[PDB]
């Protein structure tokens, strides 16, 4: 028993982190096969940031402008290309520690692990969710750019995030590994703001199911509610609508606990309406929303990865 | 910015996990050099658990009773010895992925990462603290025994925990890597209970300093308080006494934020006295106590590990 915000083992991603240096900019890159992926603003300088034209900026660079440090070993760039907001630096050495891997663009509400890195050297690992507004509430300092987010499925690393920037509110924005920003953000230092975030309702429900599997039962009730009637109470409290597809995903957690999904929704309703009144759920005093249904099943049942 | 409950990168420990099987018991072991460490109750069976004599139980086993699975490779046990509550199975293969490593017995209040494992295969990584009552609020299912807790210091893995058992309250007990239980617990299925836990005050203070570094300032005040007067308010709310040694550890966090340690104690006092009144600190509605002063400095400043 117990329930922890749990990251995937990070050893497969640690083996891919490298330091990429160009001019006065140093950040992390991801080394898979003979290619290093990193944010394209690595080619910017201190006066390139206000409104850059990265095509113009990139035709001006040569391969020997890119210093790619892998441990105490310099990699040699032999070519470069830009796809959307990321550089691909082709290097002469294929990474022998290349895991099996995919690039995936995740939907909001989905979670992943972030291996935070500085100077190509992994510092820490934590769990995150894509917020409905396509930010992530990360922990990033300067030099953490090019750090990646990821899920692991059996033996395969699905890369889903690469870090570019902190917004003035202190949340973080970034791209998928093919370089497309999550959300409306560009990689240009301008006025930009997150957009009103909302709470991932389907995840809160999955976490309440986690609690029930782990002995917390005080918040349940006998009431039920229709899906329409739940979303009327949802939108007041700035929760996302629950779709019928959300209900079906929550099927196995309903089946294993014997609590119909619509009954857990009646629980959440009263929780939002009456507060928690000095009680806690899974050691938390707030309704947590960064566990997906995947996660709860993974952690409450025991799925590993080789 | 941001502040996350952050584990160390786990790749160095992942490379040491193995599956140890003996009779009907399968758990994880730790493979460093030519030795596999695992909990000694691996030699118990389903009727060996009520009150065992592990010396008697162990003189009865031969090396070929221990199946040591490392990936899809059987290791051969060539000898075995018991130190306190852990077996050391000597094997013919030295682990080539052996990190640099130490065994340390940590004080309560200290934190570490747990790489949760099943069948020798890492499943997840999370952060933990040794609770003042020598339990850990872990996330462990059946088969997670022999999973280890650890800190990383530069390039060296300080192993500090190995998992043995869940208590009826659902918290977890275990040994250091030299096999000495944390706390009064034995490895014998008996009536056993945790003992009244308390809140790690020095850690709560370090976390409030984290908040201040990250822009949360609402809980501060102009008041100060003496150390004695703080501990009078502490012991009511089941907090641990703050020692002068706790104050000095919190020095750099005092110096970097400009908030004298005794002034942050006056803040905590009013927080315990007046609640948080619907506000949150670092996205939390409870006073968090599983960041040490180390951690806050590590995460708010950027220390990595090669
Ligand atoms: C990468 O190492 C670095 C990490 C940042 C720094 C602090 N935590 C992080 O996540 N990334 C940057 O510093 C990034 C540079 C890059 C330059 C070309 C355009 C794309 C970004 N800049 C930022 O993260 C700044 N944010 C910002 O003002 O961008 C504009 C927008 F849209 F508002 F986000 C950071 C450094 O913000 C301030 C407020 C200046 C601290
Ligand atoms: C190792 O894989 C396994 C992990 C446990 C199971 C569920 N989560 C865990 O942390 N360890 C055990 O199951 C362990 C066996 C071992 C046998 C010889 C004596 C030392 C323990 N037993 C337990 O963790 C049980 N706890 C227990 O009752 O021990 C006595 C004490 F002191 F009360 F803790 C678990 C399985 O407890 C119950 C309540 C039966 C679920």
Swiss-Prot record, chains A, B:
Outcome recorded upon mutating residue 189 to A: Does not affect ability to cleave and inactivate human TRMT1
Phenotypic consequence of residue 142 to A: Does not affect ability to cleave and inactivate human TRMT1
Cytoplasmic side: 1-306
Documented effect of changing residue 90 to R: In strain: Beta/B.1.351
Reactions it catalyzes: TSAVLQ-|-SGFRK-NH2 and SGVTFQ-|-GKFKK the two peptides corresponding to the two self-cleavage sites of the SARS 3C-like proteinase are the two most reactive peptide substrates. The enzyme exhibits a strong preference for substrates containing Gln at P1 position and Leu at P2 position
Impact noted for substituting residue 205 to V: In strain: Zeta/P.2
Cross-linked residues, Glycyl lysine isopeptide (Lys-Gly) (interchain with G-Cter in ubiquitin): 5, 90
Activity regulation (UniProt): Inhibited by pyridone-containing alpha-ketoamides compounds 13a and 13b. In turn, alpha-ketoamide 13b (tert-butyl (1-((S)-1-(((S)-4-(benzylamino)-3,4-dioxo-1-((S)-2-oxopyrrolidin-3-yl)butan-2-yl)amino)-3-cyclopropyl-1-oxopropan-2-yl)-2-oxo-1,2-dihydropyridin-3-yl)carbamate) inhibits SARS-CoV-2 replication in human lung cells. Inhibited ex vivo by michael acceptor inhibitor N3. Inhibited ex vivo by compound 11a and 11b.
Domain of life from the UniProt record: Viruses
Residues of the signal peptide: none
Active-site feature positions: 41, 145
Segments forming domain Peptidase C30: 1-306
Location(s) in or outside the cell: Host cytoplasm; Host Golgi apparatus; Host nucleus
Protein role: Cleaves the C-terminus of replicase polyprotein at 11 sites. Recognizes substrates containing the core sequence [ILMVF]-Q-|-[SGACN]. Cleaves and inactivates human TRMT1, preventing tRNA guanine(26)-dimethylation of tRNAs. May cleave human NLRP1 in lung epithelial cells, thereby activating the NLRP1 inflammasome pathway. May cleave human GSDMD, triggering alternative GSDME-mediated epithelial cell death upon activation of the NLRP1 inflammasome, which may enhance the release interleukins 1B, 6, 16 and 18. Also able to bind an ADP-ribose-1''-phosphate (ADRP).
Quaternary structure annotation from Swiss-Prot or TrEMBL: 3CL-PRO exists as monomer and homodimer. Only the homodimer shows catalytic activity. Interacts with host FBXO22; this interaction promotes the proteasomal degradation of nsp5.
The name this protein goes by in its record: 3C-like proteinase nsp5
Source organism of this protein record: Severe acute respiratory syndrome coronavirus 2 (2019-nCoV)
